[PDB]
Symmetry: D3
Subunit: 148 residues, 6 copies
């Protein structure tokens, strides 16, 4: 995703609201996860946001700057999808680019015809085994935590 | 607090509200409460910027036509930061049914309006129970440590 | 209630909020409170439609960056209509200053979702004092009579 | 003004919210009043909404219908402008047009340089003599009402 | 159509984005073409934008100025509608009016019930036979550009 | 640049309005052109839209489908930028993709210090020589159309 930041995206200091960026982040996560969950022509479904991991906002973004939002599916469990989203600001006058934040989201597919039906998530192929292993450990961390 | 009716543009094709919609509302509540507090002792004029979102689980869906209720509370202050806990509740105004959608914790930092990116001191808060100050102090130390990776 | 920070698109070239912006927020509060009430006894599912806005004066300006606080109360019910009083207060979160922006009164009529333009019976509200019902009944009669010129 | 009504303009029933129409009405009033209060090259100003008269909503408007919003300055006092706004719905499939609402609004011009400075309003030309007298009577009745 | 230009319509300097005006232009074209294609109570339809002809932006528009959009159906073929749209900027503080844009659009009526069914366009009334001839030439010109 | 199509982007049939797409195309054109015109760190400028030409809408896009907007600078004259934009629709439930739109936009860099000052456009490198010649022919034809 690429969008010019507008006055209504920003506070009175002209700096973009956290909420504006969070919204864009989730939009990217929703597209990528829904596409994936339908990618093997299983039951028609839409991915629902189940969890947002801790995220830190490192640098401001200003009106007139371009928000760049990119997403990657980094893990899949039996019924869930982990998405990592990166947000970068670009000033197209000066050329300066800054990392706004990195967020991690967990999605769960729900049947279009039965909203209470959690679907199985198709596997992804990992470029690196360490990526599957790291993803598994993150999956475990949140599973264990939610087990109270 | 804050409430608003969920509209078509707030929801997916299933009729369920996008997480991003609720996240935006949560941050709107945090911004108001933290900005007010950071100017509450008439210090240098400032606006609270969102520094951190803690992990948060979405427990129940919300649908078009349901009312999102968003409430915020300042639960800790450090020298230069504000911790805010936000609760989101969905209300179906046809059936009456209310459900807890989400609980989220946020951290804000006040930045001067006049001095670009100047971090300001946060006025102290008073704790209903002193157990709460200690718990908040522990939460503060935990994020301070986690960020210094 | 409802609260929202005023944004540049809410305001004219001078930074002052448009009447239309506030009118919209007023009606949003009215729509929620009246719809909830009209479904509160689980009658035929319905949505409250705005029938009337009483005369209303805008007492003080609001500015970009101030927080609009909107609060509503059902003050009367007739057989098929709901009277709602709405208060709008501005809050400057930098200075702490609060001002009454506007008081408005609205009338809603519940319409069936299933049966188009079917007007439904409104559940009675509880009054703390008989005087409240009498005062509302007088306002109801006034507008009812006027709608015959 | 003429605008197609969209889903976000309407409730779950597909009927346009009163609030949406109210916002459009005020937009029409703001334009006509601001243009008028600058029409004699006085101090630059913007008209602010002072009063909305009682108004009844007669017929619903639906998603996909076209809202027609028309305004006319019907009276001016020394420092205020009376505006009548009509809203009509047009169904462009069926051809059917309906009167949604008629509203009267009062605006007061405020200096751009000084928000607290109320400016004098230029006179309007009345097509009929009786119209000025009618507007004058309404002005005095509301001015006398505002006592508290 | 008339609308005041707002901060979100414009860049950091306060000049209106072309996209904002393009959106307004298309809205006007969609209304006028849809009404016409349903004017004889044929199968219920909505006119879809098929083409924008070479449109030129002649002068900037600013926040606070009023955009005036006017549309006219200038030619009809068997299954399409040519619409010419004019955009005028009005500064309501100074009184200045400027021609912002002239655009020519082509619409095709599609059945509402029957997803992608192209319908016949009712013929338009011409004031002079010369107008039909000129329209025909423009019709043939766009046909040629499209066949390359 | 991706985004999901929402109810307010579309008509009563669920099909996206031409205006919605035109706005997205222009946003992409504005970003790429402004970035390019500041790429050699000349006088700070923003590129203003001057022309939209010969843009055709080939297939409908629906609510819930994802719009993919891709921009490319295809010609530069001394003071203007030609941008070609393609819009592709993607159904993330079915996987189906369709070419929605092909557009051509001309931008002109205007100094931020002097809003009437048309700046020089840095040259671009052409992947195939033939593209420059084709671009020049298009450029000459439109520049002469603004003469004859
Ligand atoms: C918030 C910000 C100003 C902090 O910058 P910094 O270099 O860390 O500033 P300092 O080192 O002086 O620290 C100031 C305070 O901020 C706190 N802080 C900084 N980052 C934090 C984070 N991610 N989470 C919680 N607190 C944080 C520090 O703990 C410190 O408070 P303390 O002294 O009471 O412990 C900076 O990270 C920033 O501008 N981020 C972007 C904010 C923003 O624009 N958000 C929306 C983006 S769309
Ligand atoms: C996501 C949701 C459907 C899960 O419900 P549930 O009763 O826990 O479902 P299950 O017990 O069958 O678990 C299904 C999967 O979801 C995962 N899950 C559930 N809650 C989760 C959370 N908070 N974070 C990460 N994963 C979660 C489970 O781990 C399981 O996947 P796995 O078997 O691969 O490990 C439910 O919490 C929900 O509807 N949440 C709201 C979603 C939404 O609408 N979001 C937007 C709100 S605005
Ligand atoms: C409108 C406003 C400037 C009037 O303030 P005031 O103290 O009464 O000012 P003045 O006494 O000098 O009156 C100026 C004119 O306004 C008129 N007026 C004041 N309140 C009015 C009302 N509510 N309805 C109609 N006219 C009104 C007066 O009659 C006078 O006109 P006149 O001399 O021709 O009779 C003030 O109430 C205000 O700023 N309101 C908020 C306007 C606004 O921002 N609207 C949008 C809110 S979101
Ligand atoms: C409100 C509406 C349904 C009433 O229609 P109606 O033909 O008068 O219906 P009824 O005669 O059966 O009257 C039903 C109730 O509505 C009330 N009513 C009707 N118009 C009213 C008005 N303008 N103000 C207050 N009450 C009104 C009647 O008093 C009656 O209540 P009661 O029996 O307790 O006295 C109708 O005027 C309408 O559909 N208006 C448009 C509503 C709308 O869509 N609003 C937004 C427009 S953008
Ligand atoms: C585009 C604009 C700057 C050109 O004005 P002008 O008086 O013709 O300026 P010039 O004669 O000096 O022409 C400068 C360049 O613009 C080009 N140009 C002007 N109009 C053009 C058009 N409609 N299409 C393509 N190129 C155009 C010229 O070809 C020239 O480039 P070149 O020297 O490489 O050939 C002017 O018409 C303008 O400000 N338009 C409005 C732009 C805007 O605000 N867009 C959004 C409106 S909502
Ligand atoms: C408009 C559309 C239905 C035409 O499809 P088609 O296969 O060419 O249909 P037909 O061959 O039956 O042609 C019907 C008419 O459309 C016209 N037409 C099609 N594309 C056109 C274009 N690019 N410019 C002008 N006219 C066009 C033809 O000239 C023909 O008119 P005629 O018979 O009077 O000469 C198709 O291109 C489409 O669905 N485009 C997208 C429309 C849309 O959804 N717009 C918004 C996109 S966000």
């Amino acid at each position: 995703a690429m969008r010019i930041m507008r006055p209504d995206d920003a506070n009175v200091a002209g700096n973009v609201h956290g909420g504006t960026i969070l919204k864009m982040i989730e939009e990217a996560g929703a597209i990528i996860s829904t596409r994936h969950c339908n990618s093997q022509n299983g039951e028609r479904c839409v991915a629902a946001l189940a969890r947002v991991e801790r995220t830190d906002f490192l640098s401001p973004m200003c009106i007139g700057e371009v928000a760049h939002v990119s997403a990657e599916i980094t893990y899949t469990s039996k019924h869930s999808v982990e998405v990592q989203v990166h947000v970068m600001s670009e000033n197209i006058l000066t050329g300066t680019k800054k990392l706004t934040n990195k967020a991690t989201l967990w999605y769960v597919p729900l049947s279009l015809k039965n909203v209470d039906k959690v679907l199985e998530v198709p596997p992804i192929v990992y470029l690196r085994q360490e990526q599957e292993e790291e993803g598994r450990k993150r999956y475990e961390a949140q599973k264990l935590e939610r087990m109270e």
